[PDB]
Each structure stands twice: as structure tokens, then as C-alpha cells.
Amino acid sequence: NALAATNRNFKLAARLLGLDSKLEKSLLIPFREIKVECTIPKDDGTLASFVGFRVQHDNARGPMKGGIRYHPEVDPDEVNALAQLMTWKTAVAKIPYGGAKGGIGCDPSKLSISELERLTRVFTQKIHDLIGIHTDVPAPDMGTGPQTMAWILDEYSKFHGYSPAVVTGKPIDLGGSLGRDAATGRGVMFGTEALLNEHGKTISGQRFVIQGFGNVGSWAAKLISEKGGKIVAVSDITGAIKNKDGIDIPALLKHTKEHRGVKGFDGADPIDPNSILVEDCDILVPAALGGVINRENANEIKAKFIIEAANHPTDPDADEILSKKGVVILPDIYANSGGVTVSYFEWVQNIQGFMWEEEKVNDELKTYMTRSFKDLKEMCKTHSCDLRMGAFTLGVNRVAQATILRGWGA
Amino acid sequence: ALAATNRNFKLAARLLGLDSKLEKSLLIPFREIKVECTIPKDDGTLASFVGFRVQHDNARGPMKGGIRYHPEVDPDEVNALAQLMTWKTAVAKIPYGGAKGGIGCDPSKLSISELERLTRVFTQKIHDLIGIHTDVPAPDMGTGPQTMAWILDEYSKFHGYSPAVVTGKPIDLGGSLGRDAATGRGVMFGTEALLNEHGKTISGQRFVIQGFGNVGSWAAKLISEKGGKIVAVSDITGAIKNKDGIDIPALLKHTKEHRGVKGFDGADPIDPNSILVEDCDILVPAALGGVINRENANEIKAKFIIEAANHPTDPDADEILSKKGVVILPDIYANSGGVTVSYFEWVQNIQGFMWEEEKVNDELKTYMTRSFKDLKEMCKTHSCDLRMGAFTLGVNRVAQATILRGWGA
Amino acid sequence: LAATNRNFKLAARLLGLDSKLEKSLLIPFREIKVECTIPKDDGTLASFVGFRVQHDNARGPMKGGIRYHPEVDPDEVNALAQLMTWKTAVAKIPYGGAKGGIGCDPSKLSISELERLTRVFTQKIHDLIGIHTDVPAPDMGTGPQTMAWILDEYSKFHGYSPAVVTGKPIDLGGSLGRDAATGRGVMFGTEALLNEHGKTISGQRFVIQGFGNVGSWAAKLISEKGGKIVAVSDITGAIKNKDGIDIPALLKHTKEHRGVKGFDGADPIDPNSILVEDCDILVPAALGGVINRENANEIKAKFIIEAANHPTDPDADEILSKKGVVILPDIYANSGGVTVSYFEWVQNIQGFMWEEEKVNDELKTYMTRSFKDLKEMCKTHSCDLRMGAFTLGVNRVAQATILRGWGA
Amino acid sequence: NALAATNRNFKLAARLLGLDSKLEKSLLIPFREIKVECTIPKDDGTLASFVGFRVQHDNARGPMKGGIRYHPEVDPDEVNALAQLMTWKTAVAKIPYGGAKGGIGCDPSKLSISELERLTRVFTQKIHDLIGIHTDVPAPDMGTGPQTMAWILDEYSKFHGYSPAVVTGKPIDLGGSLGRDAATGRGVMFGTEALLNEHGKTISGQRFVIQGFGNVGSWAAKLISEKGGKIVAVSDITGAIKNKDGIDIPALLKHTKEHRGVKGFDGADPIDPNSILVEDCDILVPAALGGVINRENANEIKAKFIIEAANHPTDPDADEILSKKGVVILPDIYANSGGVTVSYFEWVQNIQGFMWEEEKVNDELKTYMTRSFKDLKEMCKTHSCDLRMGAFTLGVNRVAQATILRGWGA
Ligand SMILES: [K+]
Ligand SMILES: [K+]
Ligand SMILES: [K+]
Ligand SMILES: [K+]
């Protein structure tokens, strides 16, 4: 209900710009769509056939970037929307990538680790000629992780020699970047301060509600509290906890790693899991799932700021409700761009054959996100639009310019 | 009768002892590609088209399949034809796999300069996905030898001169002699093979040929030259009959002059809808699919039907004509002379040395008789009709190569 | 071992070969060792060494088998690779000599492990071989399926490459007549040898020691050319018939059973006396060094066809050299195999398979020409057949080496 | 030779870690071993045939690195040991290389410069397909030098285009690195300060005896005196000299370069050339050859610290004797790693197409060696072992982790 909106925002941005319909159509059509057969022997000896795939949407601004999703549900339209979304996101970030997205229709929880490596290596064999250091650089996604990237790297290197830059999100021992783990969360804290400063405020003192406590949410909470932010409520799959005076995030993290959830945490009262988004605060950070803010609860949001750390957490219905209430929303396409930005930095480090210290990684991230927020701000002033539309017009403009500069045939 | 393809495959897999897991893998195509083809039109404005190529199976060698320029593109049909080509090349005993591709577009609305432009972009967008030993495209609806010349030309910018990358080229650019008559000549070859098995020969037999294009005319020419009596021929302009035999050479001059058979002295005109039920020995549907169907199958008087066209017999008519004792030479074999000679064109390009036409035709006789022998022996093995014998033979060969090559332990 | 090197220096001195050029001809072009580590079926790791000696490629791509065997003597492997270089030159096929394998016991591995290992080996050497570089073939412990796996795995790195290996299944581009190739070659050379002496295969009495893949095929085609196969031995025992063993009937018996011992139509004889049987033509077809000091004087044949490799070590060579026993050397006699393996490659290069009659007809052409070239070397240097073969082969490699030059 | 101890140290380190015996077996086996025929025309026209070779031991952690030896003595076992040592050495240094080692069995002192170029190019032609920018990067060694590398670079570039990164040790005019001459000596001084700092000490004031005065030894004395180190005794090819207040190193360096030895230096009294190891001081630097410290001279060593600047300078017996005395030994695998580390920097600069100023080379060298020393120490803390074993365990562990992360197929 918010991802079908991708094409809508695009067409909206294209109309904000003076985009010609013929160029718009070209930008909509992906550069390449690939489906491959992945047949492996299972541990019981019998054959198992899976379909791997890769949508390579756009490469005008450089090599394509996108995750590999191991998930049984594969909608052709949905995957295409994500590949296109990555094209604008990389453009908003001003990193020299295009957008792509791939995966294998499969359920990893029903495969042995032996089968998952076997499956991953076959998939790499079937697409090795379609990706590459300067063509398409995959990344982890739902159902895959650093070990997956390691296996891809190993098999790919058999066909083209050692190629650490062919995937990002690798283990540190295999050429992964420092700061990759904290990247998206750190970006969320960075972008929040940029937006607050634009209103004469700073993170220090503000009250935060963080819905979701996975990698992104947990890191956000850590770095934000370290900036003086008052984290008053946090939820995860195990429950939701509140502390009006501020949750001690270091203590929570220590509890959360040991106990595998925020539930049972001494030092914060448990609260109704369905009250977390409507809890009283200044800044609301949806950091788990999509569609959690909708027509059913938009009027009950109390924050003046919503930092879309998760993807598509706010449906179009809630978007217009909160606008007509003075709520500013930092759109996900910008708010969580620290991840893909740092992945660009990982690739750069591999291209340069020399890793950066973490202070440099983080320093460049601050620079890239400061600049992109400024450009994002100026697009809004130019087109008298909200932040989300400013991000899409900014992204579509850059792709369109690069496309035009490179030309079509004769 | 086209969507019936999976029916023939699923049956053949059951006639063979194929494991259900291996059967599913054989159904899954090796690769499916969609590419953006945007070109500047003659007026300067942009035009965007989608090109595509389904590469179904390559167990038995490089993939082979036509390129279709047509605005209507059904994904299932494209996949079905690619799968069909996999079985057909296996029946032919030529070392290819099956593929099928094209661009969704209407060439009648494009200038010739735009069509070259569009063809070159498509080649640039897929050149890394085809190749001398990978995938050898060929013409199909909306493309022809000129299109192949353009592909050859653009592909060679990326890989050096590569005449073997496409078949159906002009003779001047390494196309094969005998390429025009190949399908038609193959039909006559398969007819004699089938008749020889019944102690009969072409000489004397009465032929009805529905459709008089390249395939139909060539069959009529070469069959009449073997002593066959063509008693009726129909085409887009009408149908003409002569119970004592139509003089094909004279008819060919009339049809080349008058762009149709209607008006030919030496054959009375007859109802174009009556052509399939005319009295004869051998009926050659050579125009369209499904022309022999549930409504007219019982009314066929021929003891043999030579499927020169593709899918001329619906499953319904297959059983009616089977029980009435009609032997049907199935399309997958009967018109394989074309794909066989396209293999010969490629072989000649691979060997850097063209064949005399007599060699082309002589190898074709060898390839189609030997494949008929194997086709015959499969039917006896499984007590099945020719069409089912062909699918089981084709699926068995691919399965053998797939199993020999393995799935990485 | 050093058995080969002994013939080589002898041939090198027969020709006027420069000692420095001779040293280079002896040194192999390349020696490769690679680690092949696979997970075993129980999950634990297993590490094997693969290897390939690439001896000489002056005359074209190198050719040689892959042997899966636990015993790996570096001296043997180099000797075999060097021998292949000479063998391909006597055959006049445009190949050089190479030889490789994996130290492992295939009898202790599942087919899953054997496939895994084969593919890993291919990954480890794919960049060191190729359709125009080095074309492997089956050998001890490998067969057509092994070639199929190599073909499949190699093709992931370089596209479909049927010509990268020979000995493939026919379903994957293997040659017709490949199975009978070596056996037919021995029959061809026997007729050439007899024709030089005013005799023909027809009428001559054959005792055939060994009835494996090669021996069985030899017996078949000679019986069909009128040869009287009067005694045959193999791993299970020996049978004799002065009027001739019916090779089809013998083949029927052996195909049902696992040996000829029990064959109606030939009474059994002593398994170790076959070499000393009364006949005109004796064919050692099993193992090396079997013709030796202990039984050389008791050979009654005037003709010995070396179907096996190194069946006569130097000791018997000189004993039989006197008294007039003719020996057709292994380097030529079993070259039918490597010749038809060349034809398999040619067919794959041409993308168009040959009828079997063409394979066999070209086989007859290539071996006749090489025999004629072989005899003239013997006449030129007043030497026996074995040295004549070495002189011919080493001459061809040296000529090719010199024409191509050394930079300068 | 403490060279044959290589397999000795490894199986120990592999046992200190929980290394599966089968994985230990694979880590022992080299990835590839190559022998090639190198036949060239000599200047008199006659043929000469040589055998070139390259052991490529391990590449789990990256491209292989190793020297090319032009030397008539070729022991296969020793060459394999050296390539294996390099695998561990690069892992301790934390540079992304594996270990290799090669050469040509030949005596360059019996060859003209024209024949040496001919032979060098023929060797490159025979192995060009087995090395590469991301595969295996050779370097000078005994019998080869910058000119050798220039010829390799030139001939290789005919086959793969300009490839300055294919070898290190190049002439500076062809992309060689600044500071490469002082690298090993400077590295010795860096590690010495790192070691002393853990003991609350600094280079300043302490007494140095430096045995051997080659490239490494001379540079060490130079850099050490400049930090305040008191070099009280020096040995070289011509003899040994002493000065209880400290030998004036700048003045001596002037004396040694003109005269080509230390024999004759005003400002330092001569001493027994065979007494050099038993001189009283704080830090003794064996900097010439291996096995110079053995059981016969171990008990009377007066230093609390031995900086193994040379390779294999301490035999196993003395290692335990000096441990049983409170003597700390900085092992050669770490102490002289400045060379290989800067060779990595040379490669990096060529990969990036942009040379570093010398100060940057030296600052990065300091960074890499302090970081590796800190890592080396924490390994000792975990395994309660000496510095030498701490280095092997650290290197073997890193290789083992990379190997496992990349996996084995199925
Ligand atoms: K596009
Ligand atoms: K398939
Ligand atoms: K040689
Ligand atoms: K290893």
C-alpha cells in the first residue's frame, strides 16, 4: 500500500520536472531483466530447482547496486519497483551507482547450510557474466548476509580472479568496511540532526520513540542517546518497553544481546505493543516494517518529526494526514541512505586496494549525507514540495541528466 | 495445439521413466532475458521497445531459435516455442538446444532506417548473451536475411567477424545454398521415408497441398518431380483442382506471374474450404495450424497427412485420424529440413568453407532418413504413434545429455 | 622410469642432434601441481594433489591422459608425457605430449566424491589447458563419464568446449569407432608388417596375450581378416586351438562371464606359457616387462606386436634382436588410440561428426603413412623397428622445434 | 637452520588454535607449484636451458607476494617453506596478500647482462598467465633487483597492457615507491619502540649492539640514534667497534660509505668480531645472518630484549634459554616485516595510479606495524605463549579464518 506508490512518486517527480514522456518511459523501463534456473542436489541426493533472478534497472550514473533476497515470495512487479527505487536512492545519495535488485525464490529456513552454500555458488555461476566490479555489485538483503557475500565472492573469483569489489557487505576479514554495521543507524542519527537543525533544534534533549530494535533501530538508539537524545520507548518482536525519563541504551543493549529481545528489561516498564507509535514524544522513528503508520493511526501520532528509518513505513493516506497537521517526515529514501553510502565506501576501499580507518568511513558518510540533505532541501524550495517529493525529484533529475548527457545512438 | 506442447512433453516424460525432479528441471528454461531497446526515430523523438530471448536448454549444444519482430508477445508462447525447439533439434539429431527471442514492435510502422537502428541496438543489448557456441539466432516473423545481415554486422564489432553467429544470412554473406528449398525438400524426404515403410513410393500417389508458399510450392515442385500427382493445391488466392494432375512447372509460372493460383488454366477452381477433404492419398497441410481439427477430421480421405506447417492437427483430430488408420507425419519431424539445413549453414561457417548445394541436399537426406530410423524405432519401443515417438525421442536425448553432464555431485 | 630416456639418447645420437638441443627436448615445457580439496560425503575435508606434465607442444596442442591412481612416480609421469610427444610424432598427428592425474584411490570414493573431485581438479587447471593448448583424455582410473564432467565444468569458464577433452560419451560429441581404435590399430600395423615380408594376416597363426579392451578388439578384426587366433590368455586363464579360436564365439562367452576360462571351442593351456606358444605372430597386450631374460630364447614367433606399453624391457629386446625376431614397438602399435582421439577432436573442431567408416578409413590412412615413414627410418639408420620409431618421432619434434626457433 | 623449523612452528600454532587436522593439512599444501623450461640463446648463439619455478602457496587472503631468486641452488622443500612463511608473514602484518616464492636455477655471475635480460623475458613469457595484478605479485630477491623487475614489468606488459602493479621493487622511474630503501630498518626501529612502550620504556637512552651493518643494520642504527638510542657496539664485514658512550652514527655512516667498512673509525675502539653478541647492553639486534645465537652463547647475552632483524637469527635452543632468563625476543617474522609492508604500499600506489609522498609511506608503515604489534600481543595474552608463537598463531589464525569464510564448494 506504500510500495505500489513507487511508480506514483516517480510520475509525480517527472511531472514536477518538465520530463518528456518519451524520456520518462525510458527511465521507467529497466535496462535488463534476467531469470536463471538454479538446480542443486539436496543433502538427500535428490534434485531441487530454484529460480534466481536479477532486475538491473538503470546504469546511467554508474554500476548497479542492489541486494540479493532469499525469500519464497517473488512478485515481478514488486522486485522491479525495488530495483527502480534503488536507482533514485543512489542518485539522492550522490554515489555513482545505478539501481538493481535480485534474489532466489527459496526459503532458507528449510535448507541446510550445506545446501545454502551449494545454492549460492550455483546462482553465482549462472550470473557471473551479468555482474562485476564495474557492472553490478550485489549486497545482502532479506535472507542473506555476510557469509552469503563471502560465498559469492569466492565462486565469482574463480571465474575472474580475485574480486573483493564484486559484492559489498563482506566480512571484515574478506575486505568488508569498518563502520558497515552501524552505517544505516548512524545515517539516521545524522539525517535527524540535519533536519532538526533546520528547525532550530538539536538531538540533545529531544524525546525519541524507536519502533523496531534490529540492526538499524539498535544502532540509531545508541548513537542518538550518545548525542544527548532521550529515548523514551522502544519496541521489538518480543515486546515494547517505556521509560519516561529515558532508557539507558547501553544497559538495554547488554540485556538485548544476552536475552535476545528487549522484553524482560529491568529499567523500563513494559507497555502495550500497539501504543508504541502513538506514544507521546517529539520524534518517532519507525525502524521495523512498512505500513505501520496508516489512515487508522495517523491522527494519533504525537511527534512533530517522523524519521523513516525503515522502508515504506508511512502509507500515502497517512502522509497527507500528517502534512495537514504540521508533522515533518524525513523520507526513507534519504533517511536510511547511510547503508548504501557506506557500501559505496566499501567498494571504493576495495577498488583502491587499501582499507580506510573507521573515522574516515564515518567522516565521509557525514559529508555525503550533509551534502545530499542540502540538495534535498533546495529541491523542496525550488518545487514548493514536501521532503519526500524533493527526494524523488532530486533522484530522477540526476538520472535523467546523466541519461541525456550520454545520448541515444544518433 | 501449441499449448498442447506441455501435454506432449508431460506424456513423453511418463512414457520414459523420467524422475519428477528431472522433469521439472527440463521444463525450467536455462535463461530468460528482457532488455530495453530505445532508439531515436527518424523524427528525432525517442522510441522504446522491449527485446527478449528465452534460452530454454543447452544440454545438447548451442541454442538455436528465431527472432520475431511482432507487437504481440505472449510469454507462455515464447517459452513454449523455445521448449519445442529443444525437442525438435533433438529429434533432428543436430547438436543444438532450444531458444526463442524477438522485439515487441510492429515493423509495418517503422522505417527501414529505424529497423536497422532497432536491430543494431538489440544486438548491442544481447551480444554478450549469444555467440558462435552459445546461441545462434535466425529469422522468424517480421525478420529476414537482411535483419540477420545487420545482426552479423553489429555483433562483429564486438567479437570480430562471426558469420556463424546467425543463420538465414544472404548467400553473399555466408548463407547456405539450398536454404530456400530446405523445408520443402525435407517434406518430400520424410514422405518417401514414411511411404517406404509401407512398401509404397511417391510415384503415382495423389497429393493435396493446402498452402502454396515457400514450403508448399517447394514440396509440390520436388514431389511432382518424383512422380507425385498433385491433384489439388490451395493458397491465399483460392484453390484449383485437377484429378489427372496439376502441371506444377506451368502453375509455378502462373503463380509467380499472377501472384496466386486462381486463374490457372489446366485446373478447375474449387471451394477453398473443401481442400482438406479432397480425395487423395497424401494430404499436406502447409499453411496454418489447426486446419485439421475436431470438425473435419473424420472427413479426411488421405491415408497419410504430412504436417509441413506447424501444429496443423489439434489433439482432437489426432485421435480421430489415428483410429481411422491415418498415419500422420508430425510437424516436429516433417518440416525439420529447415532447422537441419540451418545447422548446415552454421557448420559451413564454422569450417570456413561453403558446401556445394548437392552436398547440402545429400547431407539433409542422410540426416532426415537416419532421424526417421530412430523415430521409427522409438515408436516400436513404446508402441506409440509418430508424434509421441518424436517427443519421447527428443526428451530422452536431452535427458541423457543432462544426466551425463551432471549437477555438480 | 629411465627406460624411455635410454631409447631417446640413442635416437638423439643416431641423428646428428646437438647436445644442447637434445637437453631442451628432454626438459618438459611445464610441470603443474595443484591442491584439490573437497568435502567428503561425511562432511570432513579431503585434500588431493592433481598434476599435469606438459612435455612438448612444438607440433601443436598437447595430448595426454588423466590417471586416477594412488601411486604417483614423478619419474614415470614425466617419462609417459615424454613418450606421448614421440608417439604423436610417429602417428603424424599435430599434437604434443602431456600427462596428468590425481593421486587418489577411486575404489575408495563415492561417485559424488569422484565428481566433486573431478570438477575441483578442472577448476584448478582449466586455465592451463584448452581446445588449442592441451586436450586431456581418459587413462587408468578414469573413463568417459570423467571426461563428461571435465567437459561440463570447463565449459562454465570458457563456454561450450566439446573439443577440450576426448574419450567423451557419444551423446556429448565423442567419436564413433573410438572404442575399437587401439585394437584396430594393432591389426593394421600387423598387416603392414606382414606385407613387407611377402606375408599377409590371412593364414598367419596368432597367440594373443591379454584380453582386455585392447586385446579383445585385436582378436576380432584379425579373425575377420583371415587371421587364425590359435591361443588367447587373459586374467582368468589361457585357451588354445591349433585350428583357430572363433573370436565371436569367444567374445560371446567372455561377455557373459568375467573371463574365457570355460570356453567351449578351445581347450585350456598354461597361463604362463602363452608367451612361448608356437605361432608366427605373438602379441603381448597386458603389461610391461613381461618379455624378459627368463623366456626370450623360448619364443617361437618371428613377429612380436607390442600392443601393451613397454612389454619388452631392454633385456629381452637384445635377446630377440638376434636370431631374427621382429618386434613392432608399442610407440607405433597402439597409436591407433591417440590417432582416433585426434579425429574426435577434429570432428568437434569442425562441429560435424563423421560416419564411422570415415574414422576407420582415415585411421587406415594415418597408420599406413606412418609405417612407411617408420620403415624408411629403419632403412636410413640400419636399425630395428623400435629405434626406427624413436628416430622418426624425435626427428619430427626437433624439426618442428628448429623451424619455430628460439627467438635469437 | 631455523628455516627447517618452519613446519615446526606451524603445527604448533595450528595445535594452539583448534585447527582441524584436515584443515591443517590443507593449509600446509600449496595452492599451486609450477616448473617451466627457460631456454635462451647465449651470446655465443648456443642454447642454454634453465628451469624457472614459482610456488604459489596460499591466496585465501589475497594476491600472492614473493621474491624471485636467480640462484643455482634450488631445494624444492626450502622454496616451499619460504612461500609458506610469506603466507604467515603477510597475515601477521595484516596486508591483504598470500605467500609465494619463485626463481630461476642459474648463476647470474656466469651470465652477461644481455643473457640475463633474455632469460628474464623468457621466464616472464612462460609464467605471465600465472601471475597478475590480482593473482601473484613478484618482487626482487637474491640475484635479482629493480632492473630485473623492470624487465618483468616490460615483458609482462606486452601480454596484458601496462601493469606497473605486477611487480614491486621497481625503479622509481617506473613507479617504485619512496622510502623503500629504509623500510626494513625503519620497521625494526618502529617495532622496537612498540615493544619497549609495553615495558614503560622508550628507545631513548638504552644501549644497542647491532650485529651486521648491511642495508637493514645501517638504517636501523641511523634511525635509532635519531630517537636517542645509544648504539654502543657495531659489527660488519670488516670487524667490530665499541664506544661505551655511544658510537656517533652520522659520523660513522660517512666513514663507512667512503671506506666500505667500519675498519678504521676514529671515535670507536675496535673489539673482537666474534665477541659482538655477548656485549653488555639493553637491546641486542642480530642483523646479519641466521643461527648466530645458539646454545653456546645464550646464557651470557646481557640484553633483556633481542630484536630479530635478521632472518632465523635465534636457534630453537636459545629461544627457551633466553625465555628462562627474562629475555624478550621480537621475532623476525614481525621485526623485519617493514620491507614486505612497504612493498604492499608500492602495489597500492600503482593500483591507485598515484604515488605517495615519502612521509605518507613512512606514516602508514608506522600505523601498520603498531597495529600488528598490538594484535600480536593480544594473541599471546590469549594463548600464554612467547612473541614468536604469538606471531605464528596470529598469522595462521587469519589465514584459517579467511579460508573457512570462503568455504569449500558443496
Ligand atoms: K532505462
Ligand atoms: K532446464
Ligand atoms: K622442451
Ligand atoms: K592450501
Author numbering:
A (entry chain A), D (entry chain E): 2 to 411
B (entry chain B): 3 to 411
C (entry chain F): 4 to 411
Copy text from the publication:
In our apo-structure, all subunits are in the open conformation, even though the position of domain II varies by as much as 11.3°, with χ between 62.0° and 73.3°. Comparison of AtGDH1-apo and the NAD+ complex shows only minor rearrangements within the coenzyme binding site, which suggests that apo AtGDH1 is already well prepared to accept the coenzyme. The homohexameric assembly is in agreement with the size-exclusion elution profile (not shown), as well as with analysis of inter-subunit contacts by PISA (Protein Interfaces, Surfaces and Assemblies), which estimated the surface area buried upon hexamer formation at 23220 Å2 and the total surface area at 87480 Å2 (for AtGDH1-apo structure). What is unique about AtGDH1 and has never been observed in any GDH structure, is binding of a potassium cation, seen in both structures of AtGDH1 presented in this work, as confirmed by the CheckMyMetal server. The residues involved in potassium coordination are Ser27, Ile30, and Glu38∗ (from another subunit).
GDHs release the ammonium cation from glutamate in a reversible, NAD(P)+-dependent oxidative deamination reaction that yields 2OG. We have provided detailed structural and kinetic information about the functioning of AtGDH1, one of three mitochondrial NAD+-dependent GDHs in A. thaliana. The asymmetric unit of both crystal structures is comprised of a homohexameric oligomer with non-crystallographic 32 (D3) symmetry. A subunit of AtGDH1 is comprised of 411 amino acid residues (44.5 kDa) and can be subdivided into two domains.
